[PDB]
Amino acid sequence: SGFRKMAFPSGKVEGCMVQVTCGTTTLNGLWLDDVVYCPRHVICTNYEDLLIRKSNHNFLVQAGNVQLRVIGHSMQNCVLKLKVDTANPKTPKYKFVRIQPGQTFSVLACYNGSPSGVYQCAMRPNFTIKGSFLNGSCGSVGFNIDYDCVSFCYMHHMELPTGVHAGTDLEGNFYGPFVDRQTAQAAGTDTTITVNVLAWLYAAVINGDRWFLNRFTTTLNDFNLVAMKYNYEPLTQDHVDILGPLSAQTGIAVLDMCASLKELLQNGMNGRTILGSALLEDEFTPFDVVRQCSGVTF
């Protein structure tokens, strides 16, 4: 029993974190096989012109107390790829993946190549994440683990004025309408991830929190007019299908739960709480709820 915001065990990623230094800039890199990936910003004082000017030896890569020799360098979008003379013996089985808004992942925050903390995040609909990063955390990575495969999905690049964070996938493509520069950038207005709120209400029920349930049901059309009103993302038929397992387990159909959510949007929580929260939590996916309640291991 109990239900908690839970990160993946981070050991498989910890063995891949290194320190990358170019000039007076230091940040984190990801060492997989014989390549180190890090943000291309590490060469900043025109990325095309800045890189051609560079040479292998301008890069100092440190894995713990061992320097790695760089023998090649290339750029892929916003990510720098440093070829080193040694394959990481701790490389896990892994792949690079790009996630969608509303999906969740664990972040391993690192400083000077040293892992410091791990926490679970969601890619927001405005393509930011609500992380915790200080100066020097650039290059920290986000990931999921399935079975024994690490799926890397995020590399941290920068902090936006609102205190939220922006980054890229591991092929250097930004999530959201952001660029890797010191310039005026702002997160768009954010919205709430409706299917995740429903998943968390299902988790609440499985844990014995039932006061918000009622006898009523709604329609997708009717509810989505309410969702738009409260800056909730639209609920789609695919979302309903994904919640199917939780509906069967608890006996509350999705549109039955939507009537509960509608009521909580329109009337508040009347001073009560759900899973110890006074806000509606939207950083648990339906998969997250089933996995935690199943005891899946890696």
Ligand X SMILES: *c1ncc([N+](=O)[O-])s1
Least distance in angstroms from the C-beta of 156 to Na ion = 36
Q: Determine which residue in the list 186, 277, 296, 298 makes contact with Cl ion, applying CB under 5 A.
A: 277
51 binds ligand X (CB under 6 A): no
State which of positions 189-228 bind Na ion (CB under 5 A).
214, 216
Bridge partner list, 19: 28, 62
Which one among 36, 158, 227, 274 touches ligand X, defined by CB under 6 A? 158
Would you name the residues annotated as active-site residues? 41, 138
CA dihedral 167, 168, 172, 174 (to 10 degrees): -90
# of chain residues touching Cl ion (CB under 5 A): 5
Instruction: Indicate the residue type of 248.
Output: A
Residue 262: closest CA among 208, 231, 221, 218: 218
Choice between 39 and 172, CB closer to a copy of itself: 39
Query: Residue 23, interface with a copy of itself (CB under 8 A)?
Result: no
Instruction: Name the token pair of 268.
Output: 């508040």
> Which of the ranges 6-14, 42-50, 55-63, 266-274 carries the binding residues for ligand X, by CB under 6 A?
42-50
Token pair recorded at residue 256:
């039955």
Q: Does 20 bind ligand X (CB under 6 A)?
A: no
Total number of residues binding a copy of itself (CB under 8 A)? 50
Helical (H) or strand (E) element with 287? helix 286-294
Contact (CB, 8 A) for 206 and 2: no
Q: Segment near ligand X (CB under 6 A), from 40-48, 55-63, 104-112, 239-247?
A: 40-48
Structure tokens at 78: 């916003």
Structure tokens at 13: 């990623």
Does 297 interact with a copy of itself (rule: CB under 8 A)?
A: yes
As a whole number of angstroms, the distance between CA 76 and CA 23 comes to 21
Other C-beta atoms closer than 10 Å to the C-beta of 30 total 25
Q: Which residues bind a copy of itself (CB under 8 A)?
A: 1-12, 14-15, 108-112, 114-119, 130-137, 159, 163-165, 207-208, 273, 276-279, 292-293, 295-298
